[PDB]
């Protein structure tokens, strides 16, 4: 009809779930209506807008490395290692302070980052026990952040969740960030989103959103809990390729 | 209705393309009309009879290692690397032949493959331009089989698949293996499957079944191109976690 067929055309491109299409253009008819005639000029507004109040506030978008402890952790392959290295980096040239490395990734997988850690001249330590991973801690009491790079499973099991728990203990000084591909299905990360209930994810980090053809899935999950993402990234280049992103930005870029 | 609706049911469980779904329906129905009611004894084999038509040929899902070389590529993270250890690995004990290694990931991201191929007492070539790619196959002159490591990256960029082909000429005795994740999204596959018809995949392998929930986006693909799954990869113990599907395999696991 008027600027609503402008909207359901820009709205069916993005991956998004099939309701929340609907939904979205009902309050769009509704603010049409009860509000003050929808011109085709700020349709893209309320639209934006209304996707944007469905994810997560704004507030909760941000909270950059701040805590002395950084630990990352999820889905195999997604890019936790890679992407922590970029992090560390980043905060040493865009922070100058003091990196630090710990690596529970006990379970060959493992030489890559030490090499990393090197490059950069930054101290790690491997960690196989809760109490290993403790006693690297004190190691770092006069560090600045410490970047915590887990091994990654199938936390279907529920045995890889718990023990997740039970090295990285998850006192009051440490960020977690659930690190899924922006790659995944939404099928899948509506259940490990759920596995992972048991533990503090602070924050979101989808990767690899310059594989996935649409970030719809991606908006699909973020619309349905309480943390936003707090790095996205896009890349191989590091530490080049990491961006933090905000509701309305991350709307920008699903609208296509 | 009939065994119809006992059909329905079963397909709707799968990720199966919502067309796909009617059409098979249809293909029952038919079937019930003109050639026998269909009791609700053998619907589920006209279902998996008919699902299984559409997926290449089954004689398209065998030609297990048989090259001197083997060749795998593709997506980022899918389990290119882990995957080629378990080939190799299974070779030896399932076939006492002579294992041998190429990496073509000169882009860190080699020293997993190096020890891997120490544990076996095997040796590796690493290799930057064709010409290395090259004199290293002449020194396996007298080998095997020769499982060559290829970098992951985003093929989307043209670079990475013409490069791809360079490095990897792809002669007469050669088996490539467009190795994908289950864990992907359909859309997604779509595109990069398409950016491989310039390079000869003969098969493709289907890693991480044992995390995606359905397996409804492979079938999605695989209905739709030439070339049946040589192997499918369902976990990270190597090399236990390899396993090889037929059409009608590949089906019953579908149907959940
Ligand atoms: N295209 C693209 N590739 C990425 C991105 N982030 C990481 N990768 C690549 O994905 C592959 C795996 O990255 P890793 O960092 O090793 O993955 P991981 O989560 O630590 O892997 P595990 O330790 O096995 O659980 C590498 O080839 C990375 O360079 C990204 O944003 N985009
Ligand atoms: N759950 C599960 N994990 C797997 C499977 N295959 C591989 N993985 C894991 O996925 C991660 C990445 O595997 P890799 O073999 O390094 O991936 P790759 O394709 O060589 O990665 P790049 O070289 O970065 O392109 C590792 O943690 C693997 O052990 C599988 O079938 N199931
Ligand atoms: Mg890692
Ligand atoms: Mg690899």
């Known amino acids: 009809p008027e600027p609503l067929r402008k909207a359901e055309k820009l709205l069916q491109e993005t991956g998004i779930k099939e309701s929340t299409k609907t939904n979205t253009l009902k309050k769009l008819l509704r603010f049409s209506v009860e509000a003050g005639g929808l011109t085709e000029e700020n349709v893209v ?20 490395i701040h805590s002395k ?14 992407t922590l290295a970029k992090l560390a980096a980043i905060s040493m040239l865009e922070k100058h302070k003091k990196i630090a490395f710990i690596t529970t990734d006990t379970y060959a997988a493992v030489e890559q980052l030490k090499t990393y850690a090197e490059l950069l001249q930054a101290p790690l330590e491997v960690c ?13 009491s006069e560090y600045d952040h410490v970047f915590v790079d887990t091994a990654g499973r199938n936390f279907k099991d529920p045995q890889y969740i718990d023990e997740l728990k039970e090295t990285i203990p998850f006192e009051s000084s440490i960020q977690s960030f659930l690190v899924l591909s922006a790659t995944a299905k939404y099928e899948d990360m509506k259940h490990i989103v759920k596995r992972f209930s048991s533990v503090p994810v602070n924050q979101y980090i989808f990767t690899k959103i310059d594989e996935t053809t649409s970030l719809g899935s991606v908006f699909n999950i973020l619309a349905e809990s309480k943390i936003g993402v707090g790095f996205m990234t896009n890349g191989q280049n590091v530490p080049e390729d990491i961006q933090t992103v905000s509701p309305l930005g991350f709307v920008r870029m699903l609208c296509r």
């Open 128 to 140: 196989y026990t809760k109490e290993e991973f403790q006693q690297a801690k004190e190691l770092f």
């Open 69 to 82: 402890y950084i630990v990352l952790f999820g889905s195999t392959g997604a890019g936790k290692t890679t």
């Open 45 to 64: 507004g309320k639209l934006q807008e209304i996707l944007c109040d469905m994810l997560p506030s704004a507030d909760k978008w941000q909270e950059p």
